[PDB]
Amino acid sequence: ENKLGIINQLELNRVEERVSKENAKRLYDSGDIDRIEVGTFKGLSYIHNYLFEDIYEFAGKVRSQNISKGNFRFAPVMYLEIALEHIDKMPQRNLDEIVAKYVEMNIAAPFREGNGRATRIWLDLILKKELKRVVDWNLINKEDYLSAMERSPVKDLEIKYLISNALTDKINDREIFMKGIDISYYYEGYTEYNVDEL
Amino acid sequence: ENKLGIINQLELNRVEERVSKENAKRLYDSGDIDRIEVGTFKGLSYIHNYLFEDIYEFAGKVRSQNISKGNFRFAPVMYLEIALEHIDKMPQRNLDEIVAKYVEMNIAAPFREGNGRATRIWLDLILKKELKRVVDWNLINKEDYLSAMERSPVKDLEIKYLISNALTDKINDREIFMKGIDISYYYEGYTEYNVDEL
Amino acid sequence: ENKLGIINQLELNRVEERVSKENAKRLYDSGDIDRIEVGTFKGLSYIHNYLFEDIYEFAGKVRSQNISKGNFRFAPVMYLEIALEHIDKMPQRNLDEIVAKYVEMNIAAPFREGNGRATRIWLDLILKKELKRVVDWNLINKEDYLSAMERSPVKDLEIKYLISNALTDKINDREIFMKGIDISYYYEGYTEYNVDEL
Amino acid sequence: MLENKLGIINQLELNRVEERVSKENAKRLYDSGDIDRIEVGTFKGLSYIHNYLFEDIYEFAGKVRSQNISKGNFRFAPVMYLEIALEHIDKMPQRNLDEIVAKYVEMNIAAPFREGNGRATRIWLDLILKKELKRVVDWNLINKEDYLSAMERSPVKDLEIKYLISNALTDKINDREIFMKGIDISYYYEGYTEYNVDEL
């Protein structure tokens, strides 16, 4: 279900990876990433549209159906408008409040697809603005990340620990961002490209 | 925080069990249980107030704070009004729909405390009206019940199975109701009294 | 790490699917599938080797290190032989005992890879011998299957329900088998081929 | 319901007497100084603790179980692995908090006795911490719900229970009140609240 002419899911995986990773590279290199609202659904939507507007019509738009990914209980549509407004007002002064806000937005998962990758970019911008840190994503193991996120609605200690131990002060390091993009796509199983070669 | 003069949590547990079980016995014997709206938040609120109004000021009222217990998130206050209106509109024609409705009201957990006991009484009333059955709670083990309830937000098959294999047609049997009250309190850890001896 | 020199994971996935599916087709059509020990590790090892001896060494052989999948707690290597001996002696007289045996063998997961596909074939042979049934895998939705398997060490009701509702007496229906092979590969994410065209 | 050395046929009364008698034994275990002459960190020592607490009540006290036991959200070790599992736990290191918590988590999964594993193993844990870190747990600093949730999570990831333990560590390793309060809280974790050990 896409804007390109793709009827095969494996081909769509490769093409989505390549086009959206191209867009992520441009998001950083043009400086556009630094002109978006931080910590808000408007900003998250801007990121998501930027990554995916060529591939999906729903890019940047709040979904209309429920989503089902494993046994994780995402927000049902009926709470979604309420949830995002709540998240727009949550504080983000320190690591606890930032992780708590990230966990709430992960539960809300407002888009049909692409929530994890877009929201990881959004999280790094919150960390940069409020703590002058970003996540070095090579300091977070993939299985530990996925397990910690699935656990996070009950207790966010695991995800907090991973993030806190992966914090770096190199908030303008192009290499940290670009490799963070490759790792973020690897978490969701897309590994056909390296973003820096696009 | 209670209407009595109690500073000890264990004494509060003791008196809460005794008073609310006395009220449950009266709810059945007076016939008041037969005059309640079935399957709605209005009826559930009536039950909860009836059990707990001597002990807690919030009895029968939707909570204003979040509650956090076990391995899945109950509805946060900000969703509660939407959730209860939705639950009022859910169907209750067969066991599948009754169990799905019970699972959603358990997730809603609209009161500050006492959700489990009130909602089990409420469930028996839905079963009595729509299937001419009640639950024989002596046919549901505590460990099995708790495990199945914790699983139900993901998949209600386990709780559906326990409930259906405990269904009895003795829907006016006083002793089934009374033992059901003692068992329902045992599920939550209250065992100091026997309801028929109160 | 494989018998061909394939260094790309997406490439290996393609050839592993096609070759091993050819071996599965031959396993059924040659009738060899009917002369393998039913319900024992020896029989499972024969199935696994038959599927994977062309692609992987160690095919049919007990793994030597621990394996992980998500948070699932598979048997550690140091207990594996004990587990396999225990599983060889588990009974298989009715559906309950067969599902329980299948759940223990899923936990044992004795091979480095290919446990799910080999063990699903092994399960169908146990069912055919003991109940004169096989599973119509078309009646078991994928997400329901994976969730049920993850749940099964705690409570095997979900997988038992899915299997019990997918049982067919068409134990010589060649397409039920071959489609079962395609669906079983889809469970693990291999979707490039239809075995009957191989 | 379990066979017991008293003539008790009602589970609620067995709960009451078990709580009373075994809490009495725990008080005497500490006050007699016997707790200081137990092997630390091995199944032999845990077995000694368990027998001390429960031998008046249960024949199986201090003994490896012969059947599986099943509760909660993860499988305890099955009997067929139990001897090997305990042998392994005996050899696990305990030099720092990470290793002690990992060892405690493995022993909680092993759950070698028919019943009473949680209470005996918490005493066993405190003795390990006292020997290797010169700390014990101030159990008043670990909430019940937090404790139980962290334990259920621990076979997957021991971070939550490690956090609770480390943030409750105290150096008062000979404070009798810390111990006695720990006994009452440890029994509260499992739902036994009819007595206070110091009032026994």
Residue numbers in the entry:
A (entry chain C), B (entry chain A), C (entry chain D): 10 to 207
D (entry chain B): 8 to 207
What did the study's authors say about this model?
Enterococcus faecalis FIC belongs to class III FIC proteins, which are comprised of a single FIC domain and carry an autoinhibitory glutamate in their C-terminal α-helix.
We determined crystal structures of unbound, phosphate-bound, AMP-bound, and ATPγS-bound wild-type EfFIC (EfFICWT) and of unbound and sulfate-bound EfFIC carrying a mutation of the catalytic histidine into an alanine (EfFICH111A). All EfFIC monomers resemble closely to each other and to structures of other class III FIC proteins. Mutation of the catalytic histidine (H111A), of the metal-binding acidic residue in the FIC motif (E115A), or of the inhibitory glutamate completely impaired deAMPylation of AMP-FAMEfFICE190G (mutant panels).
